Design a protein around this ligand. Sequence first.
Ligand SMILES: [Ca+2]
Ligand SMILES: [Ca+2]
Ligand SMILES: [Ca+2]
Ligand SMILES: [Ca+2]
Ligand SMILES: [Ca+2]
Ligand code: NA
Ligand code: NA
Ligand code: NA
Ligand code: NA
Ligand code: NA
Ligand code: NA
Ligand code: NA
Lengths: 410, 410, 388, 410, 388
Amino acid sequence: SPQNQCQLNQLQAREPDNRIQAEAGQIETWNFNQGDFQCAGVAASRITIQRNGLHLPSYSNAPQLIYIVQGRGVLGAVFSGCPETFEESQQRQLDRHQKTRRIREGDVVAIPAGVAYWSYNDGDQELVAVNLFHVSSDHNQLDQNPRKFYLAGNPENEFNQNGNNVFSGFNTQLLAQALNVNEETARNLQGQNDNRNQIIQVRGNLDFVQPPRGRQEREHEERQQEQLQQERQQGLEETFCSLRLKENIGNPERADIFSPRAGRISTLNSHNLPILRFLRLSAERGFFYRNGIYSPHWNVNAHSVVYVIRGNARVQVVNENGDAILDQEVQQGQLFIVPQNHGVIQQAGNQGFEYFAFKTEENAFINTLAGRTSFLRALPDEVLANAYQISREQARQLKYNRQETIALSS
Amino acid sequence: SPQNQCQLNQLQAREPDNRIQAEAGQIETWNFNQGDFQCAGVAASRITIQRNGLHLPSYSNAPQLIYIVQGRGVLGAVFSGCPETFEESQQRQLDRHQKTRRIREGDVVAIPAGVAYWSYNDGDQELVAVNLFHVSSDHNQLDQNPRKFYLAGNPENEFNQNGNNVFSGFNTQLLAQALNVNEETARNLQGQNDNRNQIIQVRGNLDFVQPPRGRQEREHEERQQEQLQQERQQGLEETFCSLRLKENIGNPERADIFSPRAGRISTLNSHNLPILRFLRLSAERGFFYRNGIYSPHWNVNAHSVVYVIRGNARVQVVNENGDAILDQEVQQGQLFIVPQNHGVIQQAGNQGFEYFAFKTEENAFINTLAGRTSFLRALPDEVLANAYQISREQARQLKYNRQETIALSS
Amino acid sequence: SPQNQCQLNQLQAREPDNRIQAEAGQIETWNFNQGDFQCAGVAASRITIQRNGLHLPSYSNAPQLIYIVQGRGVLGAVFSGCPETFEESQQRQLDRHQKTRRIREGDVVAIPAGVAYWSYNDGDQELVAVNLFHVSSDHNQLDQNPRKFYLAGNPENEFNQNGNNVFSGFNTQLLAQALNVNEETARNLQGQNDNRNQIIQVRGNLDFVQPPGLEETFCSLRLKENIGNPERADIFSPRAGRISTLNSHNLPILRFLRLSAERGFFYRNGIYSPHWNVNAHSVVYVIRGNARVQVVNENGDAILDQEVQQGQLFIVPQNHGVIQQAGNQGFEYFAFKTEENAFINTLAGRTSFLRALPDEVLANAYQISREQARQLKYNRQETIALSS
Amino acid sequence: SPQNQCQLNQLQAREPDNRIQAEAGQIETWNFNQGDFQCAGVAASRITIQRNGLHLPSYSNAPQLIYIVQGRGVLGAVFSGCPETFEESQQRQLDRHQKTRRIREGDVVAIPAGVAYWSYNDGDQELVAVNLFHVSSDHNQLDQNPRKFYLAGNPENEFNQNGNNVFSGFNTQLLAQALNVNEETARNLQGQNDNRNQIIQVRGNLDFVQPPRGRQEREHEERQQEQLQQERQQGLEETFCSLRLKENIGNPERADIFSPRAGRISTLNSHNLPILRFLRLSAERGFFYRNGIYSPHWNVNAHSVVYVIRGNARVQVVNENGDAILDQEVQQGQLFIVPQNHGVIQQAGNQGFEYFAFKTEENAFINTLAGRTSFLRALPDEVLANAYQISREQARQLKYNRQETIALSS
Amino acid sequence: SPQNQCQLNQLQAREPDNRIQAEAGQIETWNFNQGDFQCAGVAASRITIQRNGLHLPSYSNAPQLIYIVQGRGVLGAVFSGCPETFEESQQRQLDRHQKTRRIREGDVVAIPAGVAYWSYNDGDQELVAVNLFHVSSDHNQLDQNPRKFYLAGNPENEFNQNGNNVFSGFNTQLLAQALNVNEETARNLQGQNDNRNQIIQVRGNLDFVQPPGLEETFCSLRLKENIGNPERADIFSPRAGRISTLNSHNLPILRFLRLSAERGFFYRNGIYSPHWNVNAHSVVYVIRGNARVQVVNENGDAILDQEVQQGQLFIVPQNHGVIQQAGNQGFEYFAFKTEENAFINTLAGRTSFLRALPDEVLANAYQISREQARQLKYNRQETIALSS
Ligand SMILES: [Ca+2]
Ligand SMILES: [Ca+2]
Ligand SMILES: [Ca+2]
Ligand SMILES: [Ca+2]
Ligand SMILES: [Ca+2]
Ligand code: NA
Ligand code: NA
Ligand code: NA
Ligand code: NA
Ligand code: NA
Ligand code: NA
Ligand code: NA
């Protein structure tokens, strides 16, 4: 019942449950029709893009946050009415297009609803992204189904239980009139005989106007990478048109919370990425070390939808009745929901625990139940003592025994 | 189902499903229980006020924009606890009331939810208005049904798909006491012997305190109409209480986009009319010339509910599957819905095409697939080549062969 | 003295102090370092553009409201980075440019600091406007001098008690490179051989493309409202007059600019109720008629007492009492107010400070009977425009 | 030099330096033309109103905060264009007026610039207020002089170091004409007869429409006062028109910081009083106990203008060169300036120290230099040790030796 | 003359004026009392921290932007009342502190007024930073003088063109009793025997907890963006140059601070299109290379005309026209802009002023043919960075 849609019996962490193959990669999707995805108002897909693969332009009815789990690419984003400021020099035969952005492992990229983007893998390894759609966004005025509207190709649509793109539904002769192009060129837009699906293979290098990398930025990128592996060991053009879409939230040095034997938390919200103001979304990226505990806590103003990047943790999620509706090891490649206000305790296993959480409110925050910053610490000893039937000595141990804030070292 | 209220498979442009007669005009409604009205979160109705017709005071649970299709009249909106600032001179037995607004062809007027207003046709021809209600506005805390609360008369519901007005439900003695007036008066409020419905005939002229034309001003409104008709052929009183409710969007000089052999579009949003920031609606008014093409596009952030004022167009609306869920010659007096993110193409008939669109978001905008501001121009040459399997030479014709922006000449 | 720039001793209403001539009209400025203009942080000028005159493109360090006093024309404001959406149809050799606006008598037009505009009189009668610059705007980061930077021609600078446009201080060759055009053309931009000043004569008629994402939002904001129209009044008494106000609740860009404006027409002997400006200075321009005006300071001293006439400007500083009575032909003015949502408090009328006080506080305050106190409240049954 | 007006050599606390006497009270003013008041852009006056005294209505070019240092009264502020909602029951010349506000010891009252108000003492003790004017407010577009514009009486100008209220400068015949009142009633407005100055003695009790006190608001204010005595031993009408103007910041229970042997601090800003957002002003009221210390601290975003209510303190204020530019005991009835960013330490003497601070920015805040939320405590131990040439143990003492936040005990 | 302070007759770009040698680094300063800095409302210092150098904690009354020109380092900024979230683990005399931030060449960092910070060079090369202070910021309620309030050391204050730190002005035993520490500890805070100045030498091996509700919102806000990184470009043309622009659409805190920046790299002979700053001043620091710069006022006079050089600073006042051509080795600069979301209007290229006007208004304005007009419009087919 949409009315009681969050009265959830059990919760499971789940792997994607359908794959779509394309000439140059794959898309896996977790079914959005499940009870817990509908509570959270989220849909999710994971995409892999092989070397020299091109994810075709599309836009969706839901805003999204895309976490780059692996690789290096280019994106791709189109701002309706902004001039093309990436242009070949005259000193029309020349290439020009709007700004193009480097993505890499650790980035989160915000794509507003109705904004079209493409991506390209120009790196050696596969580029893997998780795509989280806020279907419950007020920015989505359609319905609770995620949609992807494709602008090119003939895709197999990843959300649907003479052509498949938006051009393909226009009269071809009208469409050629509007473009001022021959009828055959317009048939090419309609992709009625394109067999490559949504991610296509580019022969030779894709050339576009692209500013150089590094080598000092290469230096910076390379240092980031070895630091993560060492850690797994223990007018208009200037303003609106060039807004920031992405932030690297997986850099170790970018921690907001950090205890060397416990873990790191990096948080992303309007105080970091201005567009999150508009989107009304937050994100978090943690790396808990061996046996690290994520201090138990509740989400005050959001749902948290957690993707396990690496490692495993044991996890309990408790509802208003004290029942642990989720209780399990959660493992790499899975997805689980911590509903708003439910409490949640997480302990890393022996290889650690990395996750990316997508939070369904602007400036999402938690309240902890343990640590230097806990609820228990805000109560008068005697309200503690009376509340729990305990000595004033014990009540002060509750308050001060854990001397860490959110990442608790065991 | 609410969860798929926007998975529409067919769509129609049509005229109103019902018609109500009253002493001095008529009210035609579209059924708001249609698939597409429910997906958009809108209700529409069309009002005809004859010479000396007074549409009785009412308010709605839903914000509306009223577009005036023909004629000239007076609108009186009432703002709670603002003082009367239109008053008969002392140099009570004198008339005084709130500011009266002159309405005419081309005006959009914004009425917030819960704000009572009345209108009157003091001009020559019939006064015709289209009313669009944002029923799924968050200003409407009731439910998905448009409601008209009448404060005078005994009307016929609209909106239905002794005494009917809000006074009529009060105990007649209490009300008379409350007003400090006799019972025959308080019963006259309750309107049980009123038989005229909601648009009543006024005897001789209605006299209220009204600023002169004048005249002087008479002439600019003339110079406009030999114009509108040629292209068809060849303290608190000063601030909150004086807010602008209206803007003329039908005037040819008001165009934001204009190509002489193609047509004109005028946009109305919160950078034009301040109260749209609060109501969260936009509007548009276009006039396409013979065979002009409204560039294929999608609505980024709103549905667009389109009222055809004159002429006709071939309209295709395309969903996420590439299927064209509307494909039709739209005519005068019909209304269709363009859902958010769906592709739309429109070519005017031989008599051009005139519409008013109501858009269900603040600062509603579109992205084009053809012209100088199109998504195609924003992509690198090779992403178009690779994407559509075409030559670089065909790529540049897709970018550059259409030199106009949104109103396209055939 | 800055810390006392508003300890003013005697105000007057006066016509402009200077006058500049050009080929196809004239610019009349008031002197901005009068004590009263310095106190308001305002500068004012009056432009008249003859049939077929083109006022050349320029921008200012200060935001302005322009009020159109008479005539009808066209205004071209330019916003950087916005596309051209007025374009000749195809089938480059085609004319293409930004949205063009009609101006006419009664229009108030908002021009932000740094935003270039030109205008052109394609009417019959002379086009007359008063330009009000808010020199002490937060948008002006230079200093308390109004500046006009011209982008075409060789103007005489209006703001002063081979050539002189911004192109002309650039290296002629550099500019020609930059524009990728020949030195010949680049020199025409610099305007050394130009003698027409800032308002030039167009031969034959000026033809531009004219109606008989961003493009729809930022790029097409409203710059104007017609405030002069009789039906537009917010306050109206038939024997007294009409006042129309313009602030952020009417024109969105006034939120950014932080200005308001007012337009009034008082009839024969009508009284603009005594009041004070709560949050702004009011700089008033007399369009027609005349009024007796007294402006009163914190000492009770009338620092202006004068019949004000057609063509004169005077300043009502913030918080000073003001009373105005129209003469026998009535009284028409435009007031420019230096705050967003400028408002007043009245001393007489349905909305007055006096009706707000309890009867006994009036009795005590003014040493009058309870009955005299109730006359002070209730004898004037109108709000702001009072009938003689 | 206004370019250098904050290069102060030698701050002193000072007592008022002019008194003005009136039929029913006095007004004392600190001269605004001295170095420190100019730096801060604040002017100050203190006003005493005897039993049944009426402070005549006035308004000022500067916003103000008024702290009620003693007594009980009534304040009427007038909101231009708001209707009179305090009215004699009809069950047409009866008493009606805008709402009336109780003021008492402890209240702060925000008065926007250009807004007129009057006060009346209806209690037994003298009513004493301190009035702090933000001359250098953006709301003041005149100049750096405070002004008071009186609407009644023939006041002596408290601010310049043929009646003379605002009415007295209008032609009397014109004035009587605007009001529709005989010419001798208009002369009474102009007050050239009035001998009483700005505070006048009402004869008999002043009657107005005033809601009762009882039965239990009385015993709340009772309890408030005995608790401070103990401490010293050990439509529109509903919204805009009825905005809140005062907060009681002076009672003990209202503390935001509180150490029982050190002191209490109560803070007042936009999070407490909504109008402070518009005014862009904050206040603080502290009571420090015997020998209590106010951790050294700098004001981050405001100047602080301090009025000593009672007791005394030793005080140092240190500029960017290390020189204490105020060093003295500051005493009851004095005023001192702590400019923005200057460091400041205060210790209460043997009787305590009570102050009201007026802060010239919205949401004003400090950074402490000692205690649980100090600067030193955010620095890494080793940066402490290197910065101060000290041991790791010493640095840990610096951080953790003081275990209170703002109000430190001896 | 504050009333007339932007009436600048002449301008120069120059290296710093003064020098303050310290133990482990130096701070150089351009003199904030010059005609043109007073106009912009900014003060500029350049600081170089040698290896293992620690710049001691200070705060200013002015908000600032710091551009890292070279090197690698850590910055600790302190947030009043935010918990210490970088803590050593248990199993207190464990280290514990507030978020520390890596800084590196091309990083811009925003330090609000009255916010205390320290920097430390833990890298190989010298850390080199330009500091721009917005003195005319509204956040500065003191006066038009940049102040530095040191919280440690006996600094030789860089802006004055028992020691001197804020602690050194309190009463030593009062201080000590507040701290609850001994009086000999407290006398160290006061830094009377500190010989080192404001950049001191470590001593190891500086060690801190470093990654190899409120804490997650306000307290973890973002202070820096890397604007020097080539892949960050917003405008890019391969033969001309790239430009990166920083404002509230990228860094949230700039909305509060009302500041913007820009980092450009012009390749050889590249032209920064002639333009004006619409809403701000830019203060330009030359990072490398050289350029022919001309800055033009409203009279049409180039008040700067110079080949600016590595390490020089110059000012382009609000609304003043500006053209720049990179030299033979090209041109890299950082620009500090004195308004939120600062922008320009170009005079050449696809988004120029000239493209916005009808062909015929250009023809008439400049007295050229309709076809020379189109040439001005369309001959340069780039936006901001122009190839030559
Ligand atoms: Ca980005
Ligand atoms: Ca209106
Ligand atoms: Ca307009
Ligand atoms: Ca109150
Ligand atoms: Ca940061
Ligand atoms: Na078809
Ligand atoms: Na009944
Ligand atoms: Na030259
Ligand atoms: Na007189
Ligand atoms: Na602690
Ligand atoms: Na001492
Ligand atoms: Na072009």
